[PDB]
């Protein structure tokens, strides 16, 4: 169960200190959430709405925001930026 992020997500994954170029999703999802945390994309008062508008992540995901409860939506959006080895 492995993927190669497409370059733009790979750059985003490296900005949160990823060292590889081919990951498990788990590792992808992990660095993503870390990115979300470290770029302050969450709303502290909505508590699981990620506001990715006006940020590389939103450009990758093609959406201004999403719930972390929408597992499929997010999986879909991630896989657009991936290539399964």
Which residues here bind ligand K23, judged by CB under 6 A?
29-30, 32-33, 36-37, 42, 48, 68, 71, 74-75
Alpha carbon distance 3, 63 (integer Å): 22
List of long-range contacts for 59-62, beta carbons under 8 Å, 24+ apart:
59/8, 60/8, 60/9, 60/12
Our CB check for ligand K23 shows the closer of 23 and 42 to be: 42
| Nearer to ligand K23 (CB atom), residue 6 or residue 71 | 71
- The residue (of 11 and 75) whose beta carbon lies closer to ligand K23 is 75
- Supply the Cα-derived Rg of the chain in whole angstroms: 12
Give the shortest CB-62-to-ligand K23 separation in angstroms.
Answer: 13
């Amino acid at each position: 169960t492995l993927v190669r992020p497409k370059p733009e997500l790979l750059k985003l994954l490296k900005s949160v200190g990823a060292q590889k170029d081919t990951y498990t999703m788990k590792e992808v999802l992990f660095y993503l959430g870390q990115y979300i945390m470290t770029k302050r994309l969450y709303d502290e008062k909505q508590q699981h709405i990620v506001y990715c508008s006006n940020d590389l992540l939103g450009d990758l995901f093609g959406v201004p925001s999403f719930s972390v409860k929408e597992h499929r939506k997010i999986y879909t959006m991630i896989y657009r930026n991936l290539v399964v080895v």
